[PDB]
Ligand binder design. Structure first.
Ligand code: FAD
Ligand code: FAD
Ligand code: UDP
Ligand code: UDP
Lengths: 393, 393
């Protein structure tokens, strides 16, 4: 007589699974998760290459990092973490540079050693065109942090291949993802906690969706089955984590997305580049970076006669393409505001919530996605499924 | 009527304290430790600089590292460890290079990026003068590993200032302390476990000598009091960890030692070199390296208007100088063999054991010293103090 499920979740990414796991274990409710991909985990899905055994991140490399202790403690319930610290090198004019901004990069590019004090002065001179506080876009913000000469050499070219958009049109928050230091610290991230899942990403994601009150239906599009499912559970809300503009059939227009293509190759050598990730900042090369996955897990002993590499290509996401990056131009932010209104309306009429990287058109990382899911649970979903509180304020 | 103590230990270094702690806690025996320095811990003694609060390693920088899990588990009984990974940079011709041997150093010194495969070929050509298996001394071993061009630039000069001895006379084991890689890994050590004592070295050493059955007498030379002490405990053995040649009053001759002088300076700036340790490989500079101790503990937030640095100078250890490094030339190894005979004799006549860096004329690290102390306890001291087994085989 009663309801089949207590909640619908669309997408088995870190946002969806976090939501599904909290509702199931803490509130003791049945959750149905719908994934149209052949597997779970979203873009965090990993897979072992048959010849080498090396774990391959299928949808781009994934490195976990956070400063939120609550998030850190939460994710450790489902997996252990290695003490791996992510470092990136940059390729420019046939030379590998230390990266990102630091005394290593400065002394290499400018030919001599600069003291921390001397380095600050050098950059201050080259960044005299614009102040950081008055930075509107990516180009201005980048120059105000690392100076114009370094901007032309390591930022302008890479940004061209990655976004294919005028640097003066891109958000400043994009370049502020990279730490700016005046030491020899070349850690690509600056968070308290950092590491890779010891037994791989897939094992991690399978532990979150392991509860018996969580059912996951793979190869299932929500728009194909929502007509039949929701009548079975009329009171059950829906957490949507797919493309926001797709949900409304692009009625207001199409948001700018960037998508990625990957070339995976097994090489008959033991080491290709001697590091995990190598950025290619020059335009004489079509790909943005190359991953060598064996350097992600040095604690594991892989064969030394073969190796797996992955080249990364960037282009505009079209009709049926899976979106990866929100471009977020001024025109995009305008269109986004319209969809947020339509989304706010859908929440009041049919109990449909919007979250995640794709569902909010946000440049989110794994830990930001999980934290966002925890906040949605604590403030919105839990008071509703437990105390009858409406979804809207 | 009975004996005052069950064991005498000379020197409060890591060897002595490890011995004293094991005997006291496991065998329930009274141990007297004699230290002629004003404090305990030997050269591992740390001290907070008053103006900045920064922990200063008084007798040279100390970084703990090991692959022995038994040692690792043992030391964690007395202290916690940070996740600090030691990295060294090299200064050559006004330029800071990545260090030690790796793709970073190669691509910097030779001006362009070398693949792991290309790098192996380049070094193989430059190391064609001598094979590594047939390496007798430091100079030959160094060339056979990193090639002659890199040897002249980063090894030959540094070795000159540090040892003031012909590179063909020094042991090959000296240069094999540094890892030789063909990746971008610039970790100065290659051990499984590594870190710094969270609450400092002195707190660590005080926890080992904390047991009530261990008495430590500071400012006391063993040669001044052994005439009065040993009659009080005739059955008690003695573990000597001081200079081996000094114990026999240099009767057979003087072993070659290197000693160190330090210049500690508080600077009115927040950062001097942006890294923990900077090697100076050129001869136009008197000191071998510079330490900036604030980069040893990034987890602590020190003031940013002042900093503490320490320059390190090397010279021959004379009469009353405290020895730091055994030179171990062919002449030294000959003289050493003589003292080992005299030492083997002293063990049989007056129950005097010899151990530690100074007591064995060995280039030992902290973990090698502790492991050595554990082996002496398990095989020699424990069967004697508990089962009456003689000290000699
Ligand atoms: C190349 C790349 C590298 C990254 N590296 C890092 C990193 O190193 N560290 C870090 O912290 N973050 C990294 N991220 C970011 C991170 O992957 C995201 O935070 C993460 O994907 C968050 O999950 P999400 O569920 O909000 O989005 P997604 O996990 O992509 O979840 C969305 C899922 O919804 C499903 N779906 C969509 N529409 C439907 C539908 N109609 N019906 C059914 N299912 C649907 C899709 O199958 C998709 O799998 C990286 C991202 C990319 C693209
Ligand atoms: C500059 C430097 C840097 C180093 N860095 C590292 C590092 O980063 N990581 C690492 O693992 N190892 C490092 N080491 C090595 C490490 O310090 C030694 O392993 C360590 O000192 C071992 O202790 P030990 O007791 O065998 O020698 P010591 O600790 O020097 O102990 C000897 C003690 O005996 C006492 N003594 C001597 N004679 C008498 C006497 N007649 N009467 C009373 N007392 C006496 C002395 O006071 C002395 O303190 C470094 C060494 C040096 C010199
Ligand atoms: O070598 C680089 C790396 C970063 N970026 C810029 O910084 C942004 C964020 O870089 P990040 O590596 O964080 O992007 P992601 O890992 O998500 O692909 C990119 O979009 C680029 O615009 C750059 O210009 N040069
Ligand atoms: O930049 C360097 C560092 C090391 N060495 C040689 O390698 C030996 C050991 O170096 P290490 O840093 O381990 O010595 P320590 O830290 O004990 O002073 C030194 O004696 C030198 O002969 C060198 O030639 N160049």
């Amino acid at each position: 007589m009663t309801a089949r499920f207590d909640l619908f979740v669309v997408g088995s990414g870190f946002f969806g699974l976090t939501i599904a796991e909290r509702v199931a274990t803490q509130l003791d409710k049945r959750v149905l998760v719908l994934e149209r991909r052949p597997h779970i985990g979203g873009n965090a899905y990993s897979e072992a290459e048959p010849q080498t055994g090396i774990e391959v991140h299928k949808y781009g490399a994934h490195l976990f990092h956070t400063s939120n202790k609550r998030v850190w403690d939460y994710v450790r319930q489902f997996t252990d973490f290695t003490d791996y610290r992510h470092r990136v090198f940059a390729m420019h004019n046939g030379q590998a540079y230390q990266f990102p901004m630091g005394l290593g990069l400065v002394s290499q590019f400018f030919g001599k050693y600069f003291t921390p004090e001397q380095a600050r002065q050098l950059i201050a001179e080259q960044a005299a065109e614009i102040d950081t506080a008055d930075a509107q876009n990516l180009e201005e913000k980048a120059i105000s942090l690392i100076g114009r000469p370094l901007y032309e050499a390591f930022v302008k070219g890479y940004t061209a291949k990655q976004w294919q958009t005028d640097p003066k049109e891109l958000p400043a928050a994009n370049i502020t993802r990279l730490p700016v230091r005046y030491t020899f610290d070349n850690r690509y991230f600056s968070d308290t906690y950092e590491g890779l899942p010891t037994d791989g990403y897939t094992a991690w994601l399978q532990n979150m969706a392991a509860d018996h009150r969580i059912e996951v239906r793979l190869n299932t599009d929500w728009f194909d089955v929502r007509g039949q499912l929701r009548p079975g559970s009329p009171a059950a809300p829906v957490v949507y984590t797919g493309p926001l503009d797709r949900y409304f059939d692009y009625a207001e227009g199409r948001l700018g997305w960037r998508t990625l293509d990957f070339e995976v190759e097994v090489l008959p050598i033991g080491d290709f580049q001697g590091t995990a990730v190598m950025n290619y900042n020059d335009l004489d090369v079509p790909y943005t970076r190359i991953h060598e996955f064996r350097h992600f897990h040095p604690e594991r002993d892989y064969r030394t006669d073969k190796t797996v590499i992955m080249r990364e290509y960037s282009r505009f996401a079209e009709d049926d393409d899976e979106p990866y990056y929100p471009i977020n131009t001024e025109a995009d932010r305008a269109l986004l505001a319209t969809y947020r209104a339509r989304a706010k309306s859908e929440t009041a009429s049919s109990k449909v919530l919007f979250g995640g990287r794709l569902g909010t058109y946000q440049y989110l990382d794994m830990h930001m996605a999980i934290a966002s899911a925890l906040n949605m649970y604590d403030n919105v979903l839990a008071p509703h499924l437990r105390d009858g509180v409406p979804l809207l304020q």
